[PDB]
Amino acid sequence: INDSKILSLQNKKNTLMDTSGYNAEVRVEGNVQLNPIFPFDFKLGSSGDDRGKVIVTQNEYNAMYESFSISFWIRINKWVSNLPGYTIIDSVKNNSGWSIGIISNFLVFTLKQNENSEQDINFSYDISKNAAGYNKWFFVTITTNMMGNMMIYINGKLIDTIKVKELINFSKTITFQMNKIPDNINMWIRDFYIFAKELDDKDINILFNSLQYTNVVKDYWGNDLRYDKEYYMINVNYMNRYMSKKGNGIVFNTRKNNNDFNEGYKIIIKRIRGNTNDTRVRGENVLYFNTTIDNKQYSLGMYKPSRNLGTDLVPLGALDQPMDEIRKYGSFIIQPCNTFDYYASQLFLSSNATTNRLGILSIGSYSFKLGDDYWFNHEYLIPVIKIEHYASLLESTSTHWVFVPAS
Numbered sequence: 334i335n336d337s338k339i340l341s342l343q344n345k346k347n348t349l350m351d352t353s354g355y356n357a358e359v360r361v362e363g364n365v366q367l368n369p370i371f372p373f374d375f376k377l378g379s380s381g382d383d384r385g386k387v388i389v390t391q392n393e394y395n396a397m398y399e400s401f402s403i404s405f406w407i408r409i410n411k412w413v414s415n416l417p418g419y420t421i422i423d424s425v426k427n428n429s430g431w432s433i434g435i436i437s438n439f440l441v442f443t444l445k446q447n448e449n450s451e452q453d454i455n456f457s458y459d460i461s462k463n464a465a466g467y468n469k470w471f472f473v474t475i476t477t478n479m480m481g482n483m484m485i486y487i488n489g490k491l492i493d494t495i496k497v498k499e500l501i502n503f504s505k506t507i508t509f510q511m512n513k514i515p516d517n518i519n520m521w522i523r524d525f526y527i528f529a530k531e532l533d534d535k536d537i538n539i540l541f542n543s544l545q546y547t548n549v550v551k552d553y554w555g556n557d558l559r560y561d562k563e564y565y566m567i568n569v570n571y572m573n574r575y576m577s578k579k580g581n582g583i584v585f586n587t588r589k590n591n592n593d594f595n596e597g598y599k600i601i602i603k604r605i606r607g608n609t610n611d612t613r614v615r616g617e618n619v620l621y622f623n624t625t626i627d628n629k630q631y632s633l634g635m636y637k638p639s640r641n642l643g644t645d646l647v648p649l650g651a652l653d654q655p656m657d658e659i660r661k662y663g664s665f666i667i668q669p670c671n672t673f674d675y676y677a678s679q680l681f682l683s684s685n686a687t688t689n690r691l692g693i694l695s696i697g698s699y700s701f702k703l704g705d706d707y708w709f710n711h712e713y714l715i716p717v718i719k720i721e722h723y724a725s726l727l728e729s730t731s732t733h734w735v736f737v738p739a740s
């Protein structure tokens with residue numbers, strides 16, 4: 334409910350300001366970059382004395398702090414598991430207030446009563462699902478009740494709760510600056526809001542969704558997915574695998590460098606149906622995939638395997654196919670699929686480049702012959718389309734595909 338909003342930090346015509354009506358002073362110092370297109374984020378780094386600093390000084394209010402909520406979008410790169418301690422958003426003055434910091438895989442909200450007494454709650458990201466760092470946009474919501482609980486949500490899901498110690502002096506200043514605690518990282522923020530009440534589960538999820546274009550598909554880091562751009566296409570079940578080729582088949586190989594994404598072939602997404610005013614990829618767009626291998630441009634498309642892999646299964650491969658083959662055998666309908674853990678998409682086989690769905694793109698290990706195979710079948714982990722009878726796979730995580738920018 335926006336009637337409780339008492340701070341609203343936003344980029345408006347390339348100027349950070351408070352749009353809430355309470356007109357807090359916003360000062361910008363040093364290397365702060367503002368994004369002129371959505372989501373209109375500001376960017377800070379950790380290097381230099383000219384490091385980047387946003388000071389928000391609230392105006393005449395702090396008379397409304399028995400319950401409050403803090404909400405914002407944030408992205409950190411490269412947020413590695415051994416990250417040193419950093420304060421990033423600080424509102425502490427004379428040893429009381431609150432603070433937001435990061436260390437290792439933790440983001441920590443600290444409610445500071447005195448120099449001696451101090452409570453914190455945190456979100457610790459799942460390292461097993463983020464081998465290359467948690468470098469994706471996420472939505473933080475912190476709700477505090479001075480006579481109740483102190484909670485943190487991430488992407489609208491509750492993570493950590495603590496009872497507040499019942500007896501605090503709040504600072505009028507909020508300072509966005511990446512300050513190390515006695516290699517270089519970047520930080521993006523947008524839509525930093527403070528509410529003068531304790532938001533509940535329902536309001537937080539309404540808020541969460543209201544700040545996104547739900548039908549704009551996202552890349553792995555949460556930025557808008559785009560046509561005519563090189564990506565690494567990776568399946569959620571097999572994040573430790575890169576795309577390769579054998580014969581006319583696409584095969585997935587195990588990564589040598591698991592702490593980043595720089596292996597295998599790159600795909601470019603090509604629009605067939607969609608909005609031409611921009612380059613963004615949207616749900617119900619129909620599209621196809623190109624990839625460049627040994628300087629020859631191929632396109633992804635179905636092919637007949639050496640043997641039947643299973644009922645209703647057809648493998649997806651890299652073929653030198655003319656546009657009419659792409660239409661019949663390699664056109665897809667994309668739908669966004671965002672989870673707490675990842676920004677992904679589902680891909681349905683298009684009937685002749687229409688929005689009519691014939692199957693779903695999944696993945697699996699199958700034993701058959703590719704390339705120069707002759708005498709024996711071999712196990713290959715391949716992208717595979719389940720035709721017609723794919724109802725059980727709709728909820729399956731094997732149909733969740735992500736796209737990591739390959740610059």
Ligand SMILES: CC(=O)N[C@@H]1[C@@H](O[C@@H]2O[C@H](CO)[C@H](O)[C@H](O[C@]3(C(=O)O)C[C@H](O)[C@@H](NC(C)=O)[C@H]([C@H](O)[C@H](O)CO)O3)[C@H]2O)[C@@H](O)[C@@H](CO)O[C@H]1O
Binds near residue numbers: 570699
């Ligand atoms: C049937 C069964 O329970 N088998 C057990 C194994 O289950 C498979 O485990 C492998 C891991 O080695 C995979 O996780 C596989 O899951 C998927 C997958 O590959 O991601 C889900 C996909 O939906 C499915 N694809 C399609 C198109 O349906 C594939 C696919 O069926 C296979 O890849 C084809 O070979 O499978 C699990 O099914 C696993 O628990 C092992 C561990 O011991 O135990 C087997 O008993």
